[model samples]
Target: HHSAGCPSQCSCDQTLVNCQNIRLASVPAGIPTDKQRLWLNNNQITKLEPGVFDHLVNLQQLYFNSNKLTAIPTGVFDKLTQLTQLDLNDNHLKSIPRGAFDNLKSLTHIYLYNNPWDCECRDIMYLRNWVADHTSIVMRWDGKAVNDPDSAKCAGTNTPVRAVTEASTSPSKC
Candidate 1:
């Protein structure tokens, strides 16, 4: 296994697997795919290209904390089934697409702290319900704990919280 790039940015020593404080927009092209533990914290990544992690099948622990990610495309994590711990804290995430995390079935520990989440209708309600049932997913809105009661109340209402004054809004049947 070869290690390239700055020591702090991409260090792959046998004992240490720290890759914190990097200037990478996306994941590097090549790295030791057999590494069980990996850390890519403190970067400026916006979106993860599809199949970017296809080669990292053996990764058991991975961290992508402190980045800018709005929506993770479906099947972006289709290969990492052995992942036990995953962290995506301190990022710019407005919402997560449905089934965005379905690939990580073996995931046990997840850290999602200090991210800006828009608690609007539609996606937010679904995400709230998913997090409530899935015991592994953890979310940190601001610095305090995420109050599920407030989220439940917001989702329980039949009418939209914001007014849809336009009577022309027609309802379509599935």
Candidate 2:
């Protein structure tokens, strides 16, 4: 059923907002701050505007899978301390900026498969190290093991993201 604070093209069920497959190129306005789960997957959202979700302190799960996202603005997820699950699978993401996920204090699971993760030196280093350090948090959708090492891979190659060592990448001179 539709709710008062829900976006025009979506439906709200208590704390859950179903905005999946709605062709939203950007985050819709008017989402209730108290909502816990937001289904923004299967859209065309390419950029996550910073501070757009800062007010949703109570949100826990964010489903952004199967979008056309290519970049995540810094400080976008900084206020989502209670976020436990984040789905980013099936996107066009090449590299994520540093400290992008640094503030996710309660993050338990993440989906990162089917993206063209860039393995160019430090470009992909952040995600590689992050995935390596957060093995238990990375998840697989293929009914395989959680924290599956081979699930997230590099673009133009078959190397698993967790296996990318800093020793093999270009020097971090930037």
Candidate 3:
């Protein structure tokens, strides 16, 4: 019922797993821990189960774009230290919880455009600061920097989330 410990719904080849456009509602079980890259984009996934990806220690790139994710629980990605690139574009994310990216020491690029980002001063406080401090890592799918004026825009507004965060003077809750 499995393919070398890989889920039946996925195609396992070497260190890569292909699960794109499969309409998965949640992360499948039994993915090999030795895998380096995973493709889960263009699915119907809504929420990620905490620690579901904790065991993919060797994962370096994760393609999770075009899903239905509305929230990211804190510490959900705390274990993937080897992850260098992540894609979360075209989702329903509104805000990122604190410490979500604190352990991603090896992360160099992340795509977060096209989400309905909640630009509320309080709701975006952490993401705002994170984006400000890690400008180099936050990038668009087109490889543009977050500082690019054409980067991700806030929902229902013309201003970029980057701009909203930059103009914010709210007291830190970090």
Candidate 4:
């Protein structure tokens, strides 16, 4: 049930559930809303324009690996609340906006490794706690642990922790 205006370099079919290697700079509007899975890997898309995926309420699986995206627009995933698996690996994202995943309560597996993550205190504090508390769901790369709480604070003029190697290993004894 797909329509025209699809990227000429990509493949599109009415019965096909997955659309891979589209070479799309941005998602084409008017795609059928009945699709349950969409594979949009290997593209040059830099930003997810608002309402690009607004109608995909039924979408369950999405793969956005290997792109040039630096930041995701807010409400981009608002309609896809049923989404279970989302793969955002291998992108140029530096930071995730607060409440970025607020609508994705049903999300089970989120693969964010291999991206250039800025492991600053303020940026990663919530992530560190989330990873530790939600071990059954949130998995860290290589079982890497978060640094000390004090070292995780980001203050003006003070450099925030950028890498796990910069964290201290010594524990404070009472």
Better model by lDDT, 1 or 2?
Answer: 2
User: Order of candidates by lDDT, top first?
Assistant: 2, 3, 1, 4
lDDT of 2 by residue, 1-174 (tens): 953878889999988999998899999988889899999999999888878898988889999999998888879999999999999999999878888999998988899988988776667788988888888888877675377757788888868988887767764632
Candidate number achieving the greatest lDDT relative to the actual structure: 2
> What TM-score would every model get versus the actual structure?
0.70, 0.91, 0.88, 0.68
RMSD of each: 6.7, 2.7, 3.4, 8.4
What residue pairs clash in candidate 4, if any at all? none
Specify the highest-TM-score model's number: 2
Candidate 1 CA-lDDT value: 0.62
Worst 10-residue lDDT window for candidate 4 reads 165-174
Candidate with more favorable, higher TM-score: 1 or 4: 1
| Each prediction's whole-model lDDT (CA) | 0.62, 0.86, 0.82, 0.61
Which ranges in model 4 have alpha carbons more than 4 Å from their true place? 1-17, 129-133, 138-174
The alpha-carbon lDDT assigned to residue 125 of candidate 3 equals 65
Error of 3 at 11 (Å): 0.6
Q: Can you tell me which runs of candidate 3 are displaced by over 4 Å?
A: 1-3, 143-150, 165-174
